[PDB]
Design an enzyme around this catalytic site. Sequence first.
Site, PDB file in Angstrom:
ATOM      1  N   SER C 132       0.841  -1.187   0.000  1.00 48.48           N
ATOM      2  CA  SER C 132       0.000   0.000   0.000  1.00 48.48           C
ATOM      3  C   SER C 132       0.879   1.241   0.000  1.00 48.48           C
ATOM      4  CB  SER C 132      -0.935   0.028   1.209  1.00 48.48           C
ATOM      5  OG  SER C 132      -0.210   0.237   2.406  1.00 48.48           O
ATOM      6  N   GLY C 138       5.063  -0.182   3.147  1.00 43.78           N
ATOM      7  CA  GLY C 138       4.563  -0.297   1.791  1.00 43.78           C
ATOM      8  C   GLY C 138       5.066   0.774   0.850  1.00 43.78           C
ATOM      9  N   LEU C 244       1.360 -12.914 -19.719  1.00 43.80           N
ATOM     10  CA  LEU C 244       1.744 -11.750 -18.917  1.00 43.80           C
ATOM     11  C   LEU C 244       2.463 -10.692 -19.743  1.00 43.80           C
ATOM     12  CD1 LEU C 244       1.333 -11.316 -15.777  1.00 43.80           C
ATOM     13  CD2 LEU C 244       1.010 -13.649 -16.481  1.00 43.80           C
ATOM     14  N   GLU C 246       1.989 -10.068 -22.988  1.00 45.62           N
ATOM     15  CA  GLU C 246       1.191  -9.497 -24.065  1.00 45.62           C
ATOM     16  C   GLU C 246       0.048  -8.603 -23.603  1.00 45.62           C
ATOM     17  OE1 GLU C 246       0.246 -12.891 -26.294  1.00 45.62           O
ATOM     18  OE2 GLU C 246      -1.181 -13.749 -24.872  1.00 45.62           O
TER      19      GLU C 246
END
EC number: 3.6.5.-
Lengths: 426, 49, 431, 439, 277
Positions: C132, C138, C244, C246
Amino acid sequence: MREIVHLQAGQCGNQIGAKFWEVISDEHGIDPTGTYHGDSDLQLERINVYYNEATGGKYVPRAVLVDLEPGTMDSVRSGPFGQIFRPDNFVFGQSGAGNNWAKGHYTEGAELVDSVLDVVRKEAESCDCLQGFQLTHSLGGGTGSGMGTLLISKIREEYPDRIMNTFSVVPSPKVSDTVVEPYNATLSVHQLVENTDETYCIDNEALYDICFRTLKLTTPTYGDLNHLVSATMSGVTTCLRFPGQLNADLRKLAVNMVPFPRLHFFMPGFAPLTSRGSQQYRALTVPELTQQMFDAKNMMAACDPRHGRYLTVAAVFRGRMSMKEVDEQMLNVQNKNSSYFVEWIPNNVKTAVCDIPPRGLKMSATFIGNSTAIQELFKRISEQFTAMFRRKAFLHWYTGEGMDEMEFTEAESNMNDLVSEYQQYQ
Amino acid sequence: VQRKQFLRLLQNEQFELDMEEAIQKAEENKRLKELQLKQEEKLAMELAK
Amino acid sequence: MRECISIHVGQAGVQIGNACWELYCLEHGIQPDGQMPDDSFNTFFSETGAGKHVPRAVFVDLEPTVIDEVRTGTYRQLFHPEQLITGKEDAANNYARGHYTIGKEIIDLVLDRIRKLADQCTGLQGFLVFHSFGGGTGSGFTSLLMERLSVDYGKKSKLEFSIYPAPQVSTAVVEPYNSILTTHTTLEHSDCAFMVDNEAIYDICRRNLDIERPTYTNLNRLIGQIVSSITASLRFDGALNVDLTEFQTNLVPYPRIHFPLATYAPVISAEKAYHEQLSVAEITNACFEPANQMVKCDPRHGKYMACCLLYRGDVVPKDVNAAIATIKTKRTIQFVDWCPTGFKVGINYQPPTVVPGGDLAKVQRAVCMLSNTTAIAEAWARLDHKFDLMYAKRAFVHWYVGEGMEEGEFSEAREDMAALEKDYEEVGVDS
Amino acid sequence: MRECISIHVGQAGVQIGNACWELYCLEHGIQPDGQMPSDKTIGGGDDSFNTFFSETGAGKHVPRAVFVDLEPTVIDEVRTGTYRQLFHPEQLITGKEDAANNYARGHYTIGKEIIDLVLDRIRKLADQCTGLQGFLVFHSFGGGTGSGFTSLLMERLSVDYGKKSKLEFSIYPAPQVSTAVVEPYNSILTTHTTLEHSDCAFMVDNEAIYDICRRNLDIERPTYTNLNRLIGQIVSSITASLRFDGALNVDLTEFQTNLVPYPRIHFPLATYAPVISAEKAYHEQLSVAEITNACFEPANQMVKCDPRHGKYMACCLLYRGDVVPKDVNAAIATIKTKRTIQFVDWCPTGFKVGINYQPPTVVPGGDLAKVQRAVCMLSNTTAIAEAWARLDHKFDLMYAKRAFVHWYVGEGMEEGEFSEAREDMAALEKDYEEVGVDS
Amino acid sequence: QNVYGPGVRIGNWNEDVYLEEELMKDFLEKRDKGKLLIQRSRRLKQNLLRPMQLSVTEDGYIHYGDKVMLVNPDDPDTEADVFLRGDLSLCMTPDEIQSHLKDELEVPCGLSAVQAKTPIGRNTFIILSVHRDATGQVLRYGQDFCLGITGGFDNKMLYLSSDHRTLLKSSKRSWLQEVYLTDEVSHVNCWQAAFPDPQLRLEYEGFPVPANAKILINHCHTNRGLAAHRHLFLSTYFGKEAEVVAHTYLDSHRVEKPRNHWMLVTGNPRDASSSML
Ligand SMILES: Nc1nc2c(ncn2[C@@H]2O[C@H](COP(=O)(O)OP(=O)(O)OP(=O)(O)O)[C@@H](O)[C@H]2O)c(=O)[nH]1
Ligand SMILES: Nc1nc2c(ncn2[C@@H]2O[C@H](COP(=O)(O)OP(=O)(O)OP(=O)(O)O)[C@@H](O)[C@H]2O)c(=O)[nH]1
Ligand SMILES: Nc1nc2c(ncn2[C@@H]2O[C@H](COP(=O)(O)OP(=O)(O)O)[C@@H](O)[C@H]2O)c(=O)[nH]1
Ligand SMILES: [Mg+2]
Ligand SMILES: [Mg+2]
């Protein structure tokens, strides 16, 4: 993993602290003997925060009891939980301070502190990862203000990067118990601004009114007010010992609530306070606690929040609560009071929710406040300073001990720097 | 040597007995705590009613 | 040979992963022990000695409060004991405490696990980092983690899922500072970062699922389904499958505009699903309605820029085509002129799976929309406006400069989100 | 099977031997009647008492020790005390007219009369020993019997038994407080003889135990009974390897080998830790590091000499109880990095470690507390030459005026060895300096 | 530093939790399968110390097939300072270490004398005839009889036995002739009862032996009397026991010593669990 060192000084400090170990030993299931008897597994999960283990898996508290007279040192020892502390940690003198700040900081306070600093050096160096300190005292005395602020400064010269948390009972006009109260309060807070990261101001005027109106206790004993104080001490640090959805340690509470290095004086609170008669009529919900939290009659200092502005507010919740209810309630109270909060800081409020509520209750909410209204508690002490200093009354006990007259002019100037600093942003 | 071996065997038996007692005591404590809590709750219900 | 590595940093990243890995065990039939009572699990699990199925996630946090909740919870027998890495003290919502002082003392153990995990995988497809913006861990710890990853793994994709700060509701106070300081490094070492917030999911639970009292244990299930819808084209078979690499080509037109929005449909409760009819021509209109975007922003002010729809379940490809042309003739759904083809659709065969005891219903078909749009310039405008009103008076600054990071980094990071702000008008002006 | 024969001479040896031999009876569970209790049907496998207690056909256990004095004032209290049935009727030897703090009476006139009676009783005690480790001696420097009778007993012991070990526990005079007036004369003369007729001389004085019982056990008013027990606790930790089992055992030759670098230096220092009251042990945690950190502090030394002035040569650590060999290495490694503790250059590895499994046993109703782990350190230090310095300063300051000499000349001792015994330790003081020179 | 222990989540606690869980799982598996040493010892003690009922006689003559208990009476001996006091009972004794390691009894098993008065499963002997098929018979002086002990087991019968001395065969502590228990049937299991007084021994040879009386037990093939050494102690799983051997002891007047005197004890008619003592 994280450890907190406790220190108890002064007559007011020992009685609150001895009442403070009552609360958490019942929370963690410790008898006065020192043997763990609890029900849940989450209580022994973090016992290293406040306790040390001894021979036989027997628990001892990590606190140091310091005083100059054995009058209150034997009162705590002969109490309910007196047979749990370390007998070597009971460090005391023989001659009382005489309610004189010069007796506790230069004359008798400079002899004992060499033995006092050894035992707090023993407990700190054996810790795994030390997090900070904790000290309970009073600003109006000679022992609790003499070496109350002397132990703060000496530790600062040893451990630079920690968080030093103190809980001080502040003087009040109507509950004046000493003639020389305005002198000792100014002389103590001069070092409290300099060398303390967070200071909690607790007033005997607000403690009696909580006992009178909300609690409806006709004859409050000093054992009753110390239970009010001890609720807020255990609530602000409950995220270090118990799991929760939003964990916030003492340093996390330092970043949110301290915008400038000289504004770290806080008002505390306890949310589920109810009388004996009206427990049945009240309904326990999260919006009910928030209305109780933002009541003017619930904080522990005799300052009117309606004559000031709020810098930063946090509230540590305890129990099983939904998170929309907590988040939307601290948005509604900010929108419905927009002029009361500052405009150069967005989102003054702060959230903290723990999984484990206190014993015998369903929910809890510990309240903390920063406001510009704290200057009213500081103008009254500073104004009482001037009316006593101009005639040089009661000075020959201070000046005759080794103290000059130039420290009094230095400390009064520090209040008026501090009073103007709250007024500057209002 | 012979009596030392005898002592070692008796100590092994004592270890097994200690483990059995240590596993029984927790069960006794849990049963007592649960019974006390249930009785307290029932008494509160009756007096309130 | 299609493998994905998940890293869970911070409390919000880890606590979603408590509910993210709960869902993956139900998809493939793996018990919480790690045993399976054919090989579609190989994306997310590595069977090891004794037949235990070991996950492919590294759980790192500077605080021991949350990881010890998982090391004593019901998923003790699943994870590796050395993939659960802790420190001694938290970041205290300070960027310079998770990146400059305490983040350097554990970063060697973090990268040692990623190097060891990647050698077991035959063909590595990308990274799935969860954190986050607002918190110190984070922000501080994910900044140097992908900094050291981009120099070690060059061309591997880096898929990011972060909790964006909501406009009016927020927890901390210094979050305007930590959001600016995170994104200075993301624009150079991230390839596709998906924003979600906490206020939009609250309104979905209030009105769509009819939940009066949502909790953080409820939001993590909804985020756990979107990540399981993106990676569903690799585990299962489909009519046409998206790799992943494309959907990084057809969602990132410019090197600085790689912040799409995540949208799931249909999110319905149990009592409403058996009444109303769920057709393909209706579940794709639920993606475009302004109420169901999972970020607090209004899409009608901006214009859509690149859209990707990932259908799963019982879907015929015909009614998808008729639904797209239904969208394109609507005047309120405005597309940019320089991108005449903007819709990328994808059909899979596996319907969603409901977690028992959950709030979602058993639904035969679902669509996850990944929309790149210019509407999030308004979301970055309000957060920059909150930074300026706090840096004018130098509030909360001495907690940053007391760790080792100088004050010059505030003005450099401010001018970068200043720089990427006008990049949205530089691509929104019609040619 | 490995057996020790203890010798107690003087009034110090008997009063230490009253409290030391109480502990052996109370550690093996041997009653004052001489028999083990009959409630031991389950118990067995115990023959470790044969080091000190000799069996009989009646099941009676009698100690293997001799109690020597020249007056019946101290031994008649033993003969009419609690342990009258335990000791042998002949292993308690009495004289007449004592020695009156005179070395010549103890050595040449009165100590010559009864030396043949004692030497028969040692030989009568040595034939039963199928294996004998050596002798242990308890006496006092400042006495007449403890310094006079000892000086020829070690001369007769070395002639009969050639290379057998002789280890001593001596009551050195304290630097400030003491009792006798002519104590420099008796302390000089008896240690001039026993430099070459001894092998290791553990010393302890009386002031440094007064300091220990004040700030540790909180006893304001101790007596010799309180002091004799602490000396009696040191002897058990030294000898515990021969009695009970352990991971690393030390014989009476093993720690004699690892504490004397040169033949003329056989003077260790005795220390003991942890020592604490009954109440204060209930709270303080007793780690392996905290019981070896206390031994190195100068305030816990049992000889009034500061080790910071000198340099250690060799050390012996003797552990008891729930000691793991892991924590011994980590606690020693901390000490090796300390700057306050100094070592000589020619001993890179100074530590000898022994572990025994028996936790220390404490007398009922005693001042010291029941603990599970304890350590006794026999440290050799150059800073004992400070102790010889203050006494030889006292000697020539009194020998200058020929005071008290006629008590020594008129008994049978020539005045010619007053100068030679001073000239002997003049060269011994030169020896402690040359050992401490760094190469 | 400081150490706390099992429950506290500090330091290296995860590996300790794994190790204690592994140890607890192993202990529960072993105790559920039944390989526990205390359980095996409990079964062995339950088999050994079972109560038993003795026979009751009417005319005072010891019958064949009756269940009796062998008891050495107490005498104030002056031979040693320490020795067992009170009447002793002849009880078998299996090997201690082999009895702990293996469940089954290992023949041969030694014998001993224990301070016991209540008849238990360890000290009940049945007097048998080598001719067998004896009903309504009286045991007589100078006649062969055999002693058989079930030993708390309903499976097998064991008999007393001894042999001539050999350099490889000797008693445990006294180095004399030994007495043991075997299941084999031979002539080394036969014993004879004779009068203690040497003058009237041949006169009383061939008479029905009284019950609860002092008699001498003599082996046939070696002609040694059963003797109890009080002053030599045997350590046993059941405490301290007096030794038992086969040797004839004579004083200065060639009269059998109180070591060799033995008494056969029947059961009390009023209480069969208790004896005549
Ligand atoms: N949706 C959702 N958001 C969460 C959850 N936990 C934390 N957050 C968000 O995370 C934001 C800030 O991060 P933190 O909760 O402080 O956790 P962090 O990022 O590790 O920061 P530190 O704990 O101080 O190290 C908050 O504003 C929350 O909105 C969660 O369980 N679910
Ligand atoms: N610490 C301690 N010292 C003792 C004890 N008994 C005697 N002493 C010491 O002995 C010294 C006096 O000499 P004594 O032992 O009493 O007498 P002695 O050695 O037999 O000499 P003579 O009386 O002439 O035969 C005193 O200075 C004490 O220090 C004791 O029990 N404990
Ligand atoms: N809450 C509480 N306050 C106390 C108690 N005792 C004294 N005080 C307060 O302490 C103030 C005086 O401080 P004092 O005790 O003289 O300080 P000291 O002399 O240093 O110990 C008074 O204003 C009292 O209100 C107590 O038991 N409880
Ligand atoms: Mg956290
Ligand atoms: Mg004497």
